[PDB]
Amino acid sequence: CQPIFLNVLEAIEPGVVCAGHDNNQPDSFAALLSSLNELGERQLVHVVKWAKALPGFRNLHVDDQMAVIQYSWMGLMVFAMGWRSFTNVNSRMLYFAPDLVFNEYRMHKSRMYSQCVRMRHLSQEFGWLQITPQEFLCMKALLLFSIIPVDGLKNQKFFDELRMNYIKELDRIIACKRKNPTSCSRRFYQLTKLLDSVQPIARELHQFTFDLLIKSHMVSVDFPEMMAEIISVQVPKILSGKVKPIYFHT
Numbered sequence: 378c379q380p381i382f383l384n385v386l387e388a389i390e391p392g393v394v395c396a397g398h399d400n401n402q403p404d405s406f407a408a409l410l411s412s413l414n415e416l417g418e419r420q421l422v423h424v425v426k427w428a429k430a431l432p433g434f435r436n437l438h439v440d441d442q443m444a445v446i447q448y449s450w451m452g453l454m455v456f457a458m459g460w461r462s463f464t465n466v467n468s469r470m471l472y473f474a475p476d477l478v479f480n481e482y483r484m485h486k487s488r489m490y491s492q493c494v495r496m497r498h499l500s501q502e503f504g505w506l507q508i509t510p511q512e513f514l515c516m517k518a519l520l521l522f523s524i525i526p527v528d529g530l531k532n533q534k535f536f537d538e539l540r541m542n543y544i545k546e547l548d549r550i551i552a553c554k555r556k557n558p559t560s561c562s563r564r565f566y567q568l569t570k571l572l573d574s575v576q577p578i579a580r581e582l583h584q585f586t587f588d589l590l591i592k593s594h595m596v597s598v599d600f601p602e603m604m605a606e607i608i609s610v611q612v613p614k615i616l617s618g619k620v621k622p623i624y625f626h627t
């Protein structure tokens with residue numbers, strides 16, 4: 378029996394994305410954040426293509442498709458970056474891109490040191506929890522369906538159904554080599570705790586980027602088209618409490 382679901386997730390996984398950062402120049406706040414913003418713009422293009430190729434995603438109302446992507450991108454990108462950091466440099470640094478790797482000095486220079494430390498902790502958890510490449514893929518997909526508007530989506534029912542199917546696939550991945558129901562529940566607990574942990578980090582970054590966009594002209598930080606739109610139109614809905622994450626635990 379071939380693993381159709383996982384076959385698809387592996388097949389659609391985005392390739393390497395570079396930031397275009399000039400590493401020959403001394404580090405500066407403006408240059409580092411402008412590069413992170415450009416990386417975000419570039420990654421968004423891949424995240425959209427990736428999401429639209431996910432099993433059942435096209436079932437969602439067209440308006441909900443773009444909405445969930447615009448609300449969940451931060452968590453999705455942070456999670457993927459944490460995994461890249463773990464696999465490429467064993468979490469020694471934050472591997473935003475091959476040409477944008479942050480050591481502690483850069484974390485400090487970026488002015489979001491504490492947030493970077495939390496993301497490095499997340500990266501380490503991939504190792505501590507022995508997250509498999511397959512669990513990573515399924516968990517990342519679940520992050521796309523982890524934050525929605527309190528007033529409901531266009532077709533909330535289709536979303537609920539799709540999210541439930543992805544949770545079901547996570548169950549199947551956990552039960553693969555586990556014949557003990559207790560070991561399965563234990564793993565589900567670990568993975569859902571990890572997934573929940575992504576949200577507070579995303580929230581802190583949402584706040585940071587929102588504040589930065591508002592004063593971007595004062596600090597010489599460039600925000601590309603899509604990033605500026607999403608951070609001024611969608612992110613505030615999250616910060617004002619109109620759009621909220623779906624937590625597993627309390």
Ligand SMILES: C[C@]12CCC(=O)C[C@@H]1CC[C@@H]1[C@@H]2CC[C@]2(C)[C@@H](O)CC[C@@H]12
Pocket residue numbers: 410413414416417420451454455458472473474582585586589
């Ligand atoms: C999502 C990105 C870029 C893609 C990635 O690897 C994760 C990383 C997390 C920090 C984000 C950054 C995009 C640009 C942001 C939003 C900056 O404005 C401040 C926080 C940055």
